[PDB]
């Protein structure tokens, strides 16, 4: 398992088959998976260090793990970029005795730099993933080289961690199980060599590849991204809130010690005693209870302001801010969620330094139909698409036919403010009654951001109490027609940030 | 001594007994509980 | 389906500890012992096992007087599942008052050997477990393929980490290992046997428990994995195993006859692509 | 018919089955489960009027 | 082949633990 | 507090304390059937590099084990390690009756050829010149590997 | 804390007998108290008689 | 006290007690039943399934 910690440094040698025993899209695919790879690595924001050296007959070096450019991902990106398959057409043979050589050399040129006896080198993890089919027909037998390997960071039993070699077979080309299995290192409760059929599956088995769970410190939007992991491995930055024994409001953690909530869950309540957010916990499957010393509620929530008007309800500046007495203990179960307008999302986003939240803006929101999502009831994931723009002037017009509730005319500037986001139109669904608060994220380069939060609807598709699991779905003729809609976070800045000013940095 | 062979495992262990002593009496006595040069005029508790 | 075992015990240590023993044999890995021959050992006049236990592939003799001269004491056996692999059983024998006075014994099938063939030359003792390859006279018989009889089991499903056209001079035997004495006329491909080179003599070993044969005089081409052990006089030597190409090559005397000039013009073809390029695809 | 279900700890799980009769009186349900490695082999069987 | 042989329908040998 | 652990069915394996390289060895693990069904097992042991198993390594043994009874197995094995191996013996059990057990143990080889002591008893006595200052010997036997 | 815990290693080469700690006071000279532990090679047995 | 040196050490001597040193020197050295003897012989037919190593 490739180790994840801010401790130390990870060399990652990638090699690549650019042999006749692999075709052109063979190549594609091996190529496409390197630039997934090494896209993922790089989400942590880790001291990383990546070598691409494609290998055939002859081992061609791509880019250096020795050179400076190493900790940067667009060079590395690029450089990968410009691998070519004719290159090699001279030899076509499998050689891997030369990419392991190759690798060697690059180690101990590593090792004479900077000198053995520092613990610099000492601390120095290695990951070495081979995607071939195996069949290397020259050059040497492997062992020798990976002994060799070995011998030079002196892996006995006591240092087995500082070393990781896999054998990833991808694509429709032939592979020998047991080739891939020698070539692979050897461990007592792991795989270390694959065999698969596309990218997707690669994905997954990657996302298994690793281990984040020494990593504690505070980074919002980190989270699993494998289909076999528990629900709240998925989504670590959802907590609950519970007023007396019952499930009613969701949230999302913003910091070590804070929660974001909708404000029209605390309607009727000023005890915050018995009142529990549950939050994920690594060992019980109910998570861990934490008590809140200080609820903000926002001054310009009122429900029933507009009512003399023909407004029923009014939604306007629906937000409220938690904060938990005790600090929450950062694990692979809970981790916050990156909000905009600040730095660690600019960090989040590789943007450059001189960032303002106008950009984040549109970066975050250009589509007409931007893709995000939203937790269920039960923990599942579904998904909505946010509609900006000239979409957004139809949506409103929907809440205009709703005169059974609010008589008047009801456009957009009287009932729908602008703080609100569209959701619910055609392959759309929509929360139950239950989901208030819930974040509705969005994931850029595989960090998940909060744009905003459940706010109200018009259709609650759990109103049959089948379970906690079925959902209704809204009849084509069903004369309301759903139109669901969220508070618009970068609207709330002002008021977001002189109750977190010190808490994060904002931009 | 004593030797037994588990079987059909075929391991083996052994056990000894040192304590069967040869004795012409199946009792004993301990009257370390009895005090000495008691006062006279009063009962002598003699205790085994 | 049954089998006929014999236990022969004797001691030529009197001066040391003396007296009874406890004869403890493991029968083979699915066969099971008859109790009705232990029995009707036991229940002789002039018993020679006073004790007997028998369960599954465990049986446990006690021999009241070890004899000096052999004393052999036979029963017999049922088989209840397969052998499912080749392997020798273990046969040992306790002193009655010191058990930590033992003698263990190794002991094989009725046909196998009693210990594991392995190859041993001084520091290295590689393993020469498994199966022992054949004798494909592919030449001779009538098959064809598209540089996929040979060029295939040297460069795609097996890889060959050494190949050589050798002449059989000598044949000998050393041990469980047949030996033959061959010297390499060319060099077709090698990764760690550098020295090799023309007019260099090598010895293969095949074990001597199946039917291949080197005749003598003939010329063969050899190849297969390269091994670990060292000749006597430190150059590398190697074992005939299974996945290895040994193929006598046609001395065109039963060639020029046209069928078979096709065939010898594939061979020719190969041989010559091997040696000048290096594992191609 | 079988279904291989895993069992939280501290849980239970149901496993819905679809039954029509065609014939009247009374006949008996059966299901038989099997645990892995806990050798427990508990089926139980009723009966449907 | 005295008995059967039940090849190939034994347990996956993947879910049985290891003890170390 | 006593506190015993029990499993009904399961593999013991014993190994000795050191065996030397390239000498010959027996493996006898045992199958405990404490069930009260009578079974039928598939036992093998996982080839690794530097133990020369019999028949290559991937052949198993069928073997049953009757109601609340024990067999052996006996596995012949030659280590041709260096420092040590990590052996693993696998028992695989029905569909009809799903038990089975693993056990992976780590076989330790002792350094080529014997221990050796030599003792040099010296005598001490401060009170006179001679005994104030002296000298040790080293060995030169050429035995030493 | 009124506890005190420690490791050590006995030599590879230790012949078979039994081995003594001792604790005694730094001012009190002959307040000692000791614990026996026997060194021997065996391999743990499986079953007692 | 345990120690690992080389082949020559020196001596020096204080106090005036008499005693017993022992310098002990530990290293590896080069390296058929002797007394009780037993052979075992076995007659018969064996089967075996997926094992003899002939082919064809
Ligand atoms: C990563 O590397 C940088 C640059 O050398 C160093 O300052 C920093 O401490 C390292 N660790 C982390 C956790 O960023
Ligand atoms: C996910 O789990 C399923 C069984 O639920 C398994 O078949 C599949 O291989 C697993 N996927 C990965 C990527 O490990
Ligand atoms: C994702 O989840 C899997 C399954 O729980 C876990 O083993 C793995 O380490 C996780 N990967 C991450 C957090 O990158
Ligand atoms: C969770 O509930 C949703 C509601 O739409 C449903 O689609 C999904 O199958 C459920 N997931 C589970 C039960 O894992
Ligand atoms: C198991 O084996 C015994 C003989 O050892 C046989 O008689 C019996 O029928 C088998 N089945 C059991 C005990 O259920
Ligand atoms: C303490 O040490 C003395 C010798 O100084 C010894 O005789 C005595 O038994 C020791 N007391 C113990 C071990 O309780
Ligand atoms: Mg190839």
Same mark, same amino acid.
């Given at each position: ?12 040698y990638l090699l690549l088959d650019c042999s006749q025993s692999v075709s052109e899209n063979d190549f594609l695919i091996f190529k496409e998976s390197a630039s997934l790879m090494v ?12 070598a691409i050296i494609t290998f055939a007959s002859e081992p061609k070096v791509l880019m ?10 667009? !060079?590395?990106?690029?450089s990968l970029e410009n691998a070519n398959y004719k290159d090699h057409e001279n030899g076509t043979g499998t050689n891997t005795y030369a990419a392991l050589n190759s690798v060697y050399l690059m ?21 070495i993933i081979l995607l071939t089919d195996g069949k290397s027909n020259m050059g040497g037998s492997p062992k020798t080289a990976v002994?060799?390997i ?15 070699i896999y054998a990833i077979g991808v694509g429709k080309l032939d592979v020998d199980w047991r080739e891939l299995n020698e070539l692979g ?7 270390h060599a694959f065999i698969l059929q596309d990218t997707?599956a690669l994905?997954?088995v ?67 005693? +018995? ?18 010393? *200080? ?48 730095? !660690? ?17 549109? !970066? ?16 599942? *994931? ?63 380069? =595989? ?59 904002? +931009? | ?20 002593? =040869? ?22 508790? +003699?205790?085994? | ?135 494909r006279?592919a030449?001779?018989?009538?098959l064809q393929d598209e540089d996929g009889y040979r060029m295939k089991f040297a460069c795609y499903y097996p890889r060959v980490e050494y190949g050589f056209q ?20 060319q060099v077709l491909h090698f990764t760690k046997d550098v ?26 081409l050899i190849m297969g994995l390269d ?5 006597? !006089? ?9 996945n290895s190409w040994?193929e ?14 096709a065939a010898?013009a594939q061979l020719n073809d190969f041989l010559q692509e091997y040696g000048t390029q290096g594992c191609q695809v | ?49 | 082949? +005295? ?18 | ?20 390289? =390239? ?71 029905? =569909? ?50 | ?38 060194? *021997? ?9 | ?56």
């Amino acid at each position: 398992k490739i180790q994840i910690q801010r401790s130390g440094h990870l060399n990652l040698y990638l090699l690549l088959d650019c042999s006749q025993s692999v075709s052109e899209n063979d190549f594609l695919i091996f190529k496409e998976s390197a630039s997934l790879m090494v896209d993922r690595i790089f989400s942590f924001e880790i001291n990383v260090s990546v070598a691409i050296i494609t290998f055939a007959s002859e081992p061609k070096v791509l880019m250096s793990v020795l050179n400076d450019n190493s900790r940067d991902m667009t !060079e590395v990106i690029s450089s990968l970029e410009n691998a070519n398959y004719k290159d090699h057409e001279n030899g076509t043979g499998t050689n891997t005795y030369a990419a392991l050589n190759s690798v060697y050399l690059m180690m101990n040129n590593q090792m004479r730099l900077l000198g053995m006896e520092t613990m610099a080198w000492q601390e120095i993890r290695h990951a070495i993933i081979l995607l071939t089919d195996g069949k290397s027909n020259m050059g040497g037998s492997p062992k020798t080289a990976v002994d060799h390997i070995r011998e030079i960071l002196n892996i006995n039993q006591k240092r087995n961690d500082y070393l990781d070699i896999y054998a990833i077979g991808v694509g429709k080309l032939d592979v020998d199980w047991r080739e891939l299995n020698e070539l692979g290192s050897k461990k007592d409760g792991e795989r270390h060599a694959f065999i698969l059929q596309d990218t997707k599956a690669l994905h997954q088995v990657f996302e298994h590849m690793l281990d984040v769970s020494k990593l504690t410190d505070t980074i919002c939007g980190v989270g699993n991204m494998s289909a076999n992991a528990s629900d709240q491995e998925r989504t670590p930055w959802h907590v609950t809130i519970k007023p007396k024994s019952q499930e009613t409001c969701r949230g999302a953690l913003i910091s070590d010690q804070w929660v974001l909530t909708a404000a029209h869950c605390f309607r009727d309540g000023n005890d915050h005693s +018995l009142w529990r957010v549950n939050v994920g916990d690594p060992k019980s499957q109910w998570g861990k209870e934490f008590l809140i010393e *200080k609820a903000v509620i926002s001054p310009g929530f009122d429900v029933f302001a507009k009512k003399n008007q023909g407004i029923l309800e009014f939604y306007g500046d629906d937000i409220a801010l938690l904060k938990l007495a005790q600090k929450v203990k950062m694990s692979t179960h809970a981790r916050p969620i990156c909000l905009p307008c600040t730095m !660690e999302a600019n960090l989040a986003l590789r943007r450059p330094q001189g960032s303002t939240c106008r950009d984040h803006e549109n !970066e975050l929101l250009n589509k007409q139909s931007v893709p995000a999502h939203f937790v269920a009831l039960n923990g599942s *994931k579904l998904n909505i698409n946010l509609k900006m723009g000239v979409e957004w002037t139809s949506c409103a017009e929907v809440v205009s036919q709703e005169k059974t509730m609010f008589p008047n005319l009801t456009d957009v500037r009287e009932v729908v403010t602008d703080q609100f986001l569209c959701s619910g139109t055609q392959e759309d669904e929509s929360p139950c009654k239950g989901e208030a608060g819930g974040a509705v994220f969005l994931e850029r380069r =595989f960090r998940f951001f909060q744009v905003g939060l459940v706010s109200w609807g018009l259709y609650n598709p759990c109103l049959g109490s089948a379970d906690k699991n079925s959902r209704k779905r809204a009849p084509r003729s069903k004369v309301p027609p759903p139109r669901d809609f969220h508070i618009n976070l970068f609207r709330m800045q002002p008021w977001l940030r002189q109750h977190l000013g010190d808490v994060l940095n904002f +931009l | 001594a004593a030797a037994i062979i588990e079987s059909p495992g075929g391991e083996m262990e052994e056990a000894e007994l040192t304590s069967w002593y =040869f004795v012409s009496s199946p009792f004993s006595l301990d009257l370390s509980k009895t005090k000495r040069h008691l006062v006279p005029g009063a009962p002598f508790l +003699l205790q085994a | 389906s049954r089998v006929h075992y014999t236990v022969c015990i004797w001691r030529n240590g009197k001066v040391g500890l003396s007296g009874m023993a406890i004869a403890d044999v493991t029968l083979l890995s699915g066969f099971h012992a008859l109790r009705a021959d232990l029995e009707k050992l036991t229940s002789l006049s002039d018993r020679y096992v006073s004790h007997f236990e028998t369960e599954g592939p465990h049986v446990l003799l006690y021999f009241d007087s070890v004899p000096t001269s052999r004393e052999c004491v036979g029963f017999e056996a049922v088989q209840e599942v397969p052998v499912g692999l080749v392997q020798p059983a273990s046969a040992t024998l306790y002193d009655y008052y010191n058990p930590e006075r033992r003698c263990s014994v190794f002991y094989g099938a009725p046909s196998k050997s009693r210990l594991l063939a392995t190859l041993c030359s001084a520091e290295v003792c590689q393993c020469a477990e498994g199966k022992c390859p054949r004798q494909r006279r592919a030449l001779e018989r009538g098959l064809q393929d598209e540089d996929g009889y040979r060029m295939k089991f040297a460069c795609y499903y097996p890889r060959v980490e050494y190949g050589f056209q050798v002449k059989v001079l000598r044949e000998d035997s050393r041990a469980a290992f047949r030996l033959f004495e061959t010297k390499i006329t060319q060099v077709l491909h090698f990764t760690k046997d550098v020295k090799a080179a023309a007019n260099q003599m090598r010895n293969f070993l095949v074990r001597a428990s199946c039917r291949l044969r080197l005749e003598p005089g003939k010329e063969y081409l050899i190849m297969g994995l390269d091994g670990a052990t060292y000749d006597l !006089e430190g150059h590398p030597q190697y074992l005939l195993d299974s996945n290895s190409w040994i193929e006598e090559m046609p001395s065109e005397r039963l060639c020029r006859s046209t069928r078979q000039r096709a065939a010898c013009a594939q061979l020719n073809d190969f041989l010559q692509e091997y040696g000048t390029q290096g594992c191609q695809v | 018919h079988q279904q291989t279900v895993t069992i939280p700890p501290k849980s239970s799980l149901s496993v819905p089955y679809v039954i029509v009769p065609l014939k009247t009186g009374l006949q008996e349900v059966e299901v038989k489960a099997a645990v892995y490695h806990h050798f427990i082999s508990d089926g139980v069987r009723k009966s449907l009027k | 082949a +005295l008995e059967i042989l039940q090849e190939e329908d034994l347990i996956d040998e993947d879910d049985i633990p290891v003890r170390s | 507090v006593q506190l015993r652990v029990f499993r009904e069915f399961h593999l013991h394996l014993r190994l000795p304390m050191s065996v030397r390289r =390239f000498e010959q060895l027996e493996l006898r693990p045992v199958l405990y059937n404490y069930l009260d069904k009578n079974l039928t097992v598939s036992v093998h042991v996982s080839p690794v590099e530097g133990l020369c198993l019999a028949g290559g390594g991937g052949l198993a043994q069928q073997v049953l084990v009757p109601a609340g009874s024990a067999r052996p197995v006996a596995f012949s094995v030659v280590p041709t390690a260096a420092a040590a191996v990590s052996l693993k013996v696998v028992a695989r059990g029905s =569909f009809e009756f799903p038990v089975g057990d693993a056990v992976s143990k780590v076989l330790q080889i002792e350094k080529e050829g014997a221990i050796h002591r030599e003792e040099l008893v010296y005598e001490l006595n401060p009170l006179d010149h001679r005994g104030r200052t002296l000298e040790i010997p080293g060995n030169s036997d050429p035995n030493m590997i | 804390s009124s506890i005190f815990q420690d490791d050590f290693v006995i030599p590879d080469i230790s012949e078979p007998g039994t081995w003594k700690i001792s604790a005694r006071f730094s001012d009190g000279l002959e307040s000692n108290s000791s614990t026996q532990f026997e060194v *021997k090679k065996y391999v743990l047995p499986n079953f007692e008689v | 006290l345990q120690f690992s040196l080389g082949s020559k050490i020196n001596v020096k001597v204080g106090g005036n007690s008499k005693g017993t040193l022992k310098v002990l020197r530990t290293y590896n050295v080069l390296d058929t039943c002797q007394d009780l003897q037993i052979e075992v012989t076995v007659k018969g037919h064996v089967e075996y399934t997926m094992e003899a190593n002939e082919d064809y």
